[PDB]
Amino acid sequence: AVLMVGPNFRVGKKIGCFGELRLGKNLYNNEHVAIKMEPMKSKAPQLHLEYRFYKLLGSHADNAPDGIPRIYHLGTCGGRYNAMVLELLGLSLEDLFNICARKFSLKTVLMIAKQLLHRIEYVHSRHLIYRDVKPENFLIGRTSTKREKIIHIIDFGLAKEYIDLDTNRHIPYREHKSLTGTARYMSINTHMGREQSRRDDLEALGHMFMYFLRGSLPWQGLKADTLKERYQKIGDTKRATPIEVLCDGHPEEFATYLRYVRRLDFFETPDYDFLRRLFQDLFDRKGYTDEGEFDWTGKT
């Protein structure tokens, strides 16, 4: 009674956890929107710069390229609260994972991979590196707006421009950087504290595709001591795992993909066509059909 960002959108029930995600309603169009808030007194915030990365994809209210959530408004709530109003989406691949008993079929993974390699290619074309690959950040569209067969990409607060503003070239190779995203999927180089490039997004994607096919990754419940020790035991286990073994199931297409994205150079430009050509070939060599029929396209 009554939380309000911009005389238009009325906030609703809290639908997300330290940043708070909330439901909203466009009182003009009766749309249902997603509202991401941030306490004004936040040590090292990131809501504003996430909005900035969204503008570069543009992604500006009406436009929004496919797979990108529309951005409606950037305002403030109350009351010590900065807010970004964006598009409402459906469940994530991790939600759908648990729905499908934590095991995706080859057909689904291939369909997933096809979309993501496209999705992640567009991000790179807009001079950005994602750096936060995990199943929780890929959401299907709402069934209401016939986009239930579209995988979206969100959460851009941890992204970086790999094209420098001055010099207009690729960012220089530096090391001893921190340690960003999710240790479950992050690349080998990331563990070593190396600066992330376009190659490191793809390796994490590959790690994730494996997670889908297998059930989990061999560096699973490696739990011990401190957080700095937790990341180490995971990273030290990734470098001691042959790709011929990680994909032991399992078409060689996932083995050659992983070798490609790992042996890439920091500055080198990936062949997205070729990577998509490997999965599409295997797809049709199995005789699959692309109607939008995922494993979950009936379940909750």
Determine what percent of the chain falls in helix, strand and coil, rounding each to the nearest 5. 35, 15, 50
Query: Cβ(114)–Cβ(292) under 8 Å?
Result: no
Helix (H, G, I), strand (E, B) or coil at 253: helix
For residue 38, the Cα-to-chain-centroid distance in whole angstroms is 21
Q: Quick check: helix, strand or coil at residue 208?
A: helix
Structure-solving method: X-ray
36 assigned ligand-binding residue: yes
- Tell me, yes or no, if 132 is annotated catalytic: yes
List Cβ<8 Å contacts ≥24 apart for 138-143.
138/92, 138/93, 139/89, 139/90, 139/91, 139/92, 139/93, 140/89, 140/90, 140/91, 140/92, 140/93, 140/96, 141/89, 141/90, 142/88, 142/89, 142/90, 143/90
Sorted by where each starts, the structural domains of the chain and their CATH numbers stand as 1-89 (3.30.200.20), 90-300 (1.10.510.10)
Which candidate, 154, 171, 202, 200, places its Cα nearest to that of 53?
154
**Over the range 211-232, which residues count as b (16 or more CB within 10 Å of their CB) and which as e?**
bbbbeebebeebeeeeeeeebb
Quick one: which of 173, 167, 65 has its CA closest to 126?
65
Which helix (H) or strand (E) element contains residue 205? helix 198-214
Task: Centre a 10 Å sphere on the Cβ of residue 97 and count the other Cβ atoms it contains.
Answer: 20
Q: What tokens appear for 139 in the block?
A: 């959401």
Resolution of this deposited model, Å: 2.9
Catalytic residue among 62, 66, 95, 132: 132
